[PDB]
Symmetry: D2
Subunit: 358 residues, 4 copies
């Protein structure tokens, strides 16, 4: 019973999620990407945008652009591994989307302009059944971080779900094992060295909301705020008002690291922490949280689909020798690749549970 999904906003995130679907070989069999919606319907451009990626390389599948009617001037259909995907024209209000007429049940909202529970619900008024916002949402939409609180998802109450942010999906797992393994977390501050994103500018440009963020991205270290910290609070209730962090945008196309600094509740050691994370990574967090014993650098995580991959050497080596409460944990993440796979995971999960509960 192919999950009928539709992508709204075929940009970095959008394509990444689609590529995530194809990559896992779900296209056609498990998931049915009925269509993608964007300011353009030029299937040839998307084809080009999917066949070539500066950071992730070439896709393992074949992509081709075709016309729906020999009548049309430019291709408006995308064919991936045989499957046909319609390139729908973008709309102002989601409610004006032919989701219903297309048979789309799950809508992947990745335009970044409908991060509000209310506005996002327009997709349901357009014929959709469920909406996954590929970013942090407001308006009180249920936020889920695969591997930490998917079970809290209710097919009957939650219709607009948020997968949180790429950053949150790296911290939450760590924090989860930290609290689950009773290490406790009195308070904690986290710093994130992040790769520049699409919202940044190549040369000092305009940015009325984030002045610093409007400066030459590839040649500056740009500080910035991040709700990723507080956000972990919605996913892990016991951490509300206990966390907060900041971000440092630095000259790299992709892959970011997280430097979590926290104070435990009871005496403990960095080795105890180190072993727990690894243990958890080999058990209830396997697939979501991983680790490494090697001397790696950002590029070594490109295309790593774990939400958070703990740096053992970095952590063990940079903590006070005999400290018992004040600690620093380091974990990496491929902000683009990993988050993409999680989006898909959430959809499949939602789909399954939505079907089971009938």
């Amino acid at each position: 019973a192919p999950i009928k999904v539709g992508i709204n906003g075929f940009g970095r995130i959008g394509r990444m999620v689609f590529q995530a679907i194809c990559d896992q070989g779900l296209i056609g069999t498990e998931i049915d990407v009925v269509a993608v919606v964007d300011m353009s319907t030029n299937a040839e451009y998307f084809a080009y945008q999917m066949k070539h990626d500066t950071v992730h390389g070439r896709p393992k599948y074949t992509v081709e652009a075709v016309k729906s009617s020999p009548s049309v001037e430019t291709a408006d259909v995308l064919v991936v591994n045989g499957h046909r995907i319609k390139c729908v024209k973008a709309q102002r209000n989601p409610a004006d989307l032919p989701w219903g007429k297309l048979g789309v049940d799950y809508v992947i909202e990745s335009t970044g302009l409908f991060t509000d529970k209310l506005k996002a619900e327009g997709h349901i008024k357009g014929g959709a059944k469920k909406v996954v916002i590929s970013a942090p949402a407001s308006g009180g939409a249920k936020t889920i971080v695969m591997g930490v609180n998917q079970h809290e998802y209710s097919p009957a109450s939650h219709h607009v779900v948020s997968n949180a942010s790429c950053t949150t999906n790296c911290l939450a797992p760590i924090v989860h094992v930290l609290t689950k393994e009773n290490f406790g977390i009195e308070t904690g501050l986290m710093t994130t060295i992040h790769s520049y994103t699409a919202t940044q500018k190549t040369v000092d440009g305009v940015s009325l909301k984030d002045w610093r963020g409007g400066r030459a991205a590839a040649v500056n270290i740009i500080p910035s705020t991040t709700g990723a910290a507080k956000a972990v609070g919605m996913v892990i209730p016991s951490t509300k008002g206990k966390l907060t962090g900041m971000s440092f945008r630095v000259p790299t196309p992709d892959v970011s690291v997280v430097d979590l600094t926290f104070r435990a509740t009871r005496d403990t050691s960095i080795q105890e922490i180190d072993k727990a994370i690894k243990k958890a990574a080999q058990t209830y967090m396997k697939g979501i949280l991983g680790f490494t014993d090697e001397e790696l650098v950002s590029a070594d995580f490109i295309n790593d689909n774990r939400s958070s991959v703990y740096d053992s050497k970095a952590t063990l080596q940079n903590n006070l020798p005999g400290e018992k409460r004040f600690f620093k944990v380091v974990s990496w993440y491929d902000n683009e690749w990993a988050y993409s796979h999680r989006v898909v995971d959430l959809v499949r999960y939602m789909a399954a549970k939505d079907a089971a509960s009938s």
Copy 2:
């Protein structure tokens, strides 16, 4: 008789030109910047954008934002070295600009949205007397490159002048001397290694017009076309259909180089050419054309206001030892800085000429 000027579009180019004026110490005395126009009138932001620049550093003048009336919520006035500059609200049609009302004669069109002779004339219909487009223009506007064909300016026939492109202001001078010194130029192809611009994307983004140009700028070598070559033909009649070139946008915030390859009309030597360029650079091209005997690198030309600075060493060392016709000439240019100083020069020239002829 302060030149009443206005700036339409206060972005990279816009400010750059305004900073050039102040930098030259013309603000207030020689040139009077009555006001600037943009999608925002937040003088504070503008002050910020001017007091801080990733590539050029801190300005030599002081900048402060003030309120026209203590009644306004956010500053709307700029104050450079005493001179007050009004921050006007942008309009859809240049004609709807209070140029006459403000007493602005010369308008610097740097929005990039009115590069067409016709649309640009709107400023005049708006009360403006003259217009200098800070970019290549169409609609049959007089294109002028200081130090090459300014004399061809007619105070009564040319009302919308174009200062050409940053690149053309580099190749033009070289070609000019190459022709004037009777070296002759049968045909010629020019490659340009260019720093990425504001139109490029930090990460693989959208770009329907220039597909490659949409790819991550700071981490790729991106080929593109350039009218800079053919354009020299408008500035130097004898080169029509003789020149053409391409570009390669590379990972640098600013500073570009030109690799001109041509064939002479009569047997000569690279040594001859070398000496001619240098001679011209110390004479009729001084201020516009410069040269260097040092082993410089892109960075070394940052803030160099010459339109084009010939690379003697690079040139002498990379040509065929005994060649007499096929040659390669190399020259750098601070694509941002220099171009800006030329626009001002162009405005001061037209001004001085427009006045002289009464």
Copy 3:
């Protein structure tokens, strides 16, 4: 009869070549890498360096480090897909190497310290049969370019061969067809936009031989000289004194592009040339010279083992509309990857022929 090869110098070049072998699935079966030589024998480190590459990624094979005798403190043997590779200690003079005792017939010289025919012969006096220099050589060593003049290899006369430079292996193919297809080549100047290399400095450093080359590599456009052009003369005699070029080091970790400008012997067209290259790329040049009609960028050629991949769109779009003699041809190349495969190819070629002539 597995070819007995040895690698002297295990740096970027060294490893790359080895990896090229493994990558081609020749390790153990076709080619037998008896041992590698370098200032260090820490197999663990080598393993690390092979398993993680910032530019090429993770290898398709398994690499592990082991000890020759449980007696040694640190691993001194590499195990690739089962095959055992010895980590010999480096020597001052190549003749002091146990090439004979080791059973090494073909020695890949990639230290860069023995680029001279004489010094290189040291290896043979050390027991080696043939020597292939992974760089341009002097002393009068036969220089070969796979796909252009390998047929000029004399098993009985050539005991020290040079696979030329990465840049040459890109130009030669193009120049080769251009001449074979009788387009003729009166003269020509080529410009190469090259990615920075290991010899360059991260920040302004010391470089008494190449002043420019000593400037911050990832933040500048650095000109330099290059025999790559004149060198094509040694592979293609008919072009001696006709070719020459320069280089521009730019902010990228890998992949370079060649911009060849030349004048033909007879009247022709850019289309003729475009078709001739593609045709050759699909026939006698397949494997060595490829092409592409896509809007690619540097990143798109990573791990492209073709010596030279002609850019059709770039070429066709940036030449004079009706030109008949002055043309520009653009071609990309993975200076690291491709060159590495050719070195391997050359060794196998020589091996096959050296074996055939008994």
Copy 4:
């Protein structure tokens, strides 16, 4: 009574220090740089190196190379603002240096090969009176951080002094006011986002000591260790065993930032801390410690000679709303520029104090 100083090792560090002398306009008048010592005495190359700096641009003084005698083949004397500086040939053992014969009293040890108290003392045996090492030193060499503990310099007891590291000169200040203002500091962990340095590599190279540090610097986020934390322990004894930190080398040629996360001894607020730092910056720390209310990015600190410049906004905006103990303070520093100025300051201080005590 111009201070007689000599520079041993004229590289990045070497030159920066010298340039810092000239920049402050002390050359000839206040400080007499008698000569510099390096593996090369090519004044022309040093002249070049000082006249062109990628990150710091052109100098505010003139630099020319001359010959000690018309007989010498290549210049060996440096002339800055009329002052003559001798270029002496390097030696294995500092003690073989003609310091005494040249009349040098204060030697700035910046080769990076004599960071050990014992080895460095050779300079004195060579005729020198005092030695200032421009890096962290071992062997029990007094370490001073201008603005924090210069008063602990003993003319009669300390002959070999260390100016610590660029990073310590940024952390010490903050920590100093944090303790002096009685905010206390139970424990603290500092993370530093650092620009790549000269010890790093352009492309994946060799680094037996620091494996990750051997990876492509300009295209990776590379974690490393740093004694900068523990080092502040020697400068401010009250913090022994309380601090520690790690580093993140990122893709930038200069300018680093420190992220200090500490726990106060008594309840307070980030606003309290904020005000204290700002206050101290306008009083007893002026010149050493600075702050900023602006939305600045790394590039804005280029050529800022303050040891550490506190980021108010970044701080006030990224802490827990009502926290009273767990805090995060952010501060920048031009790792090259600043440190250089401090080295000079220390020398002057030592000189003044040495003189005073007769």
